[PDB]
Design a protein around this ligand. Sequence first.
Ligand SMILES: O=C(CN1CCN(c2cc(-c3cc4ccccc4s3)ncn2)CC1)N1CCCC1
Ligand SMILES: O=C(CN1CCN(c2cc(-c3cc4ccccc4s3)ncn2)CC1)N1CCCC1
Length: 225
Amino acid sequence: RIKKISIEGNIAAGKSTFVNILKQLCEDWEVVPEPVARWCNNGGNVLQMMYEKPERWSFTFQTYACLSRIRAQLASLNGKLKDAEKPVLFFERSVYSDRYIFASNLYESECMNETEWTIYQDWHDWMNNQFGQSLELDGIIYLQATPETCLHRIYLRGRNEEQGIPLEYLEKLHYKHESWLLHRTLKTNFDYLQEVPILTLDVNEDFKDKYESLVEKVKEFLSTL
Ligand SMILES: O=C(CN1CCN(c2cc(-c3cc4ccccc4s3)ncn2)CC1)N1CCCC1
Ligand SMILES: O=C(CN1CCN(c2cc(-c3cc4ccccc4s3)ncn2)CC1)N1CCCC1
């Protein structure tokens, strides 16, 4: 049985960096990269459209992202990794953050209307009632950084289309992560996530001085599942 762990965090919190550290350690540990992570630079063409007109493309973008996520995560469960006896699969984000952080935020910002938002939820619920068992998480790693840490890391990473991201937006996604993963006050449609263990890592400092302590904490955490 492959342990499934998602890595969660705000934009440019350091998910990729963290995944880069994790994917280096051993045979038994493998990462499932995030669709929207890959797009960022054919279908992933929805990204360019989102850059121009988010009110137009949000529903299409989130729908495609989540379906891409679901297939890649399902795909990945079928190694040639199904062994041996402590295989771990790391998910870059999850179907939950897709919905309760991102799609959710896009509706609150009026980039999806009531109808788009109802359809998306209807669609999301169904999908996960059809594959929830397969993709159920054994753990969540929360990469905790401040909105300002994230704003600065957006700047450093250099994507020209990301340079207009306001801090208020990062603050919103921050509240939602805190609310879901630290305070566990955000209620979802998936009651098994109320039990799911959560490792919260402060990633505000430079990863280069920290990645060792970080891995140490992850192993510690994995062994307790
Ligand atoms: O009413 C709106 C529409 N709007 C809400 C805030 N915005 C956003 C954009 C995004 C995104 C833009 C984008 C682009 C690529 C991939 C993911 C994303 S998510 N997410 C939340 N709010 C910009 C557009 N506006 C208020 C600020 C500018 C226009
Ligand atoms: O869309 C994302 C992640 N993501 C959101 C932030 N991104 C953005 C956001 C924005 C903006 C957010 C925002 C908010 C207010 C006003 C203008 C803007 S522009 N612009 C470009 N890329 C791309 C990556 N995901 C979809 C599913 C899981 C991750």
